[PDB]
């Protein structure tokens, strides 16, 4: 499951949280081998007696799932960045096994885009869409620096917190976001992540529409393998579509680097182009 991350070596142990320090509130979601709950966590941070967290309750104990649990936990404690999901630790006393994360008040980015399109309610402006895109790019720069290949970058895997802070996570094939080499040869690299970032940019600028929405899963696969490009969204300025095309070069070595994509987005976010659809 995490074999592709073998070159990543943990410096230290995972933070352990006492079961009695976690107080479950209600389910936030479910899918990837477990339910996610909102909860209160006591004695986690020094200043606050209690705070809200998101808790994933693991469904199994194969015990290949318990082996994957420990490795995943060791990997997540290593990921520490402003735009990467914040992992607090595990609870191993009893069953089910628990993983504790930061609670992100506005939920997933896909639902956030869909509800703020066609917190302050209303449609997100160009400046706000660029700010979202720059934050996701910042997280991807961090992952590329760690030699961490995400493999499933998509807005459904991003979270929105207080003050529109965006963080990348993975809530558990995403063919529509993949380049041809990932679909055909299961080749997942920093370069296939940059392609998915380009698709994330397309999702942002379409307010969360599914890529290749006019096509069946089969038609979408053939279409990506043949080299057809996603159309420019109506809300997308020409400067931003140039970034998408850079992420979508057929040759992985020709794709723009995430450092350059992030730098370009920072420039656009700081001074948005005067663009009107
Ligand atoms: C929107 C839902 C309800 C969806 O479950 N939701 C999940 C929250 C999590 O924090 C979360 C839940 N389960 C698993 C993880 N694991 C990682 O993200 C692993 C990882 C991989 C790669 C990288 Cl680069 C970083 N991290 C995270 C969360 C938090 N708040 C809210 N409101 N909803 C959440």
From Swiss-Prot:
Whether Phosphoprotein counts among this entry's keywords is yes
UniProt short sequence motif DXXLL, positions renumbered to this chain:
49-53
Q: Which domain of life is it from?
A: Eukaryota
Tissue expression, per UniProt?
Answer: Isoform TrkA-I is found in most non-neuronal tissues. Isoform TrkA-II is primarily expressed in neuronal cells. TrkA-III is specifically expressed by pluripotent neural stem and neural crest progenitors.
Effect in UniProt of substituting residue 183 to T: In CIPA; partially decreased N-glycosylation; reduced expression at the plasma membrane; reduced basal autophosphorylation and complete loss of NGF-induced autophosphorylation; loss of NGF-stimulated calcium flux
| Outcome after substituting residue 29 to E | In CIPA; following transfection in neuroblastoma cells and NGF treatment, small decrease in the percentage of cells differentiated into neuronal phenotype, but in differentiated cells, the average neurite length is comparable to wild-type; no effect on N-glycosylation, subcellular location, nor on basal and NGF-induced autophosphorylation; loss of NGF-stimulated calcium flux
Question: What does the UniProt PTM comment say about this protein?
Answer: Ligand-mediated autophosphorylation. Interaction with SQSTM1 is phosphotyrosine-dependent.
Q: Where, in this chain's numbering, is ATP bound?
A: 28-36, 56
Q: What induces it?
A: Isoform TrkA-III is up-regulated upon hypoxia in cells normally expressing it.
- Span of domain Protein kinase: 22-265
According to the record, mutating residue 236 to S results in: In CIPA; uncertain significance; following transfection in neuroblastoma cells and NGF treatment, no effect on neurite outgrowth, nor neurite length; no effect on N-glycosylation, subcellular location, basal and NGF-induced autophosphorylation, nor on NGF-stimulated calcium flux
Q: Does the keyword Nucleotide-binding apply?
A: yes
Subcellular location per UniProt equals: Cell membrane; Early endosome membrane; Late endosome membrane; Recycling endosome membrane
Query: From the UniProt record, which GO molecular function terms apply?
Result: ATP binding; GPI-linked ephrin receptor activity; identical protein binding; kinase binding; nerve growth factor binding; nerve growth factor receptor activity; neurotrophin binding; neurotrophin p75 receptor binding
The record lists the effect of residue 56 to N as: Loss of kinase activity
Q: What is the effect of changing residue 34 to E?
A: In CIPA; no effect on N-glycosylation, nor on subcellular location; reduced basal autophosphorylation and complete loss of NGF-induced autophosphorylation; loss of NGF-stimulated calcium flux
The main place the protein resides is membrane
Query: Which residues does the record list as Phosphotyrosine (modified residue)?
Result: 275
User: What does the UniProt keyword field contain?
Assistant: ATP-binding, Cell membrane, Chromosomal rearrangement, Developmental protein, Differentiation, Disease variant, Disulfide bond, Endosome, Glycoprotein, Immunoglobulin domain, Kinase, Leucine-rich repeat, Membrane, Neurogenesis, Nucleotide-binding, Phosphoprotein, Proto-oncogene, Receptor, Repeat, Signal, Transferase, Transmembrane, Transmembrane helix, Tyrosine-protein kinase, Ubl conjugation
Q: Where is this site: Interaction with PLCG1?
A: 275
**Side Cytoplasmic, residues:** 14-277
Subunit-level organization:
Exists in a dynamic equilibrium between monomeric (low affinity) and dimeric (high affinity) structures. Homodimerization is induced by binding of a NGF dimer. Interacts with SQSTM1; bridges NTRK1 to NGFR. Forms a ternary complex with NGFR and KIDINS220; this complex is affected by the expression levels of KIDINS220 and an increase in KIDINS220 expression leads to a decreased association of NGFR and NTRK1. Interacts with SH2D1A; regulates NTRK1. Interacts (phosphorylated upon activation by NGF) with SHC1; mediates SHC1 phosphorylation and activation.
Family, per entry:
Belongs to the protein kinase superfamily. Tyr protein kinase family. Insulin receptor subfamily.
Its function? Receptor tyrosine kinase involved in the development and the maturation of the central and peripheral nervous systems through regulation of proliferation, differentiation and survival of sympathetic and nervous neurons. High affinity receptor for NGF which is its primary ligand. Can also bind and be activated by NTF3/neurotrophin-3. However, NTF3 only supports axonal extension through NTRK1 but has no effect on neuron survival. Upon dimeric NGF ligand-binding, undergoes homodimerization, autophosphorylation and activation.
Protein name listed in UniProt: High affinity nerve growth factor receptor
Record organism: Homo sapiens (Human)
Gene name for this UniProt entry = NTRK1
| Entire-sequence positions represented here | 502 to 793 of 796
């Amino acid at each position: 499951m995490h074999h592709h991350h073998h070159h990543l070596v943990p410096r230290g142990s995972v933070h352990h949280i006492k079961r009695r320090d976690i107080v479950l509130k209600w389910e936030l979601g479910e899918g990837a081998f477990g339910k996610v709950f909102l909860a209160e966590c006591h004695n986690l941070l020094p200043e606050q007696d209690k705070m809200l967290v998101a808790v994933k309750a693991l469904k199994e104990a194969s015990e290949s799932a318990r082996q994957d649990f420990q490795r995943e936990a060791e990997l997540l404690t290593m990921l520490q960045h402003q735009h990467i999901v914040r992992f607090f630790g595990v609870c191993t006393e009893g069953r089910p096994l628990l993983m504790v994360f930061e609670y992100m008040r506005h939920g997933d980015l896909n639902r956030f885009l869909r509800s703020h399109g066609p917190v302050a309610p209303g449609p997100l402006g160009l400046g706000q869409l660029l700010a979202v895109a720059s934050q996701v790019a910042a997280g991807m720069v961090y992952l590329a620096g760690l030699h961490f290949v995400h493999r499933d970058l998509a807005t459904r895997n991003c979270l929105v917190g207080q003050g529109l802070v965006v963080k990348i996570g993975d809530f558990g094939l995403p063919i529509r976001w993949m380049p041809p080499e990932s679909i055909l040869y299961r080749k997942f690299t920093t370069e296939s992540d940059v392609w998915s970032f380009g698709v994330v940019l397309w999702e942002i600028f379409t307010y969360g529409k599914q890529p290749w929405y006019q096509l069946s899963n089969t038609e979408a696969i053939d279409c990506i393998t043949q080299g057809r490009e996603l159309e420019r969204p109506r809300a997308c300025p020409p400067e931003v579509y140039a970034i998408m095309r850079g992420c979508w070069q057929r040759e992985p070595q020709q794709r723009h680097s995430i450092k350059d994509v992030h730098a370009r987005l920072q420039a656009l976010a700081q001074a948005p182009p005067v663009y009107l659809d």
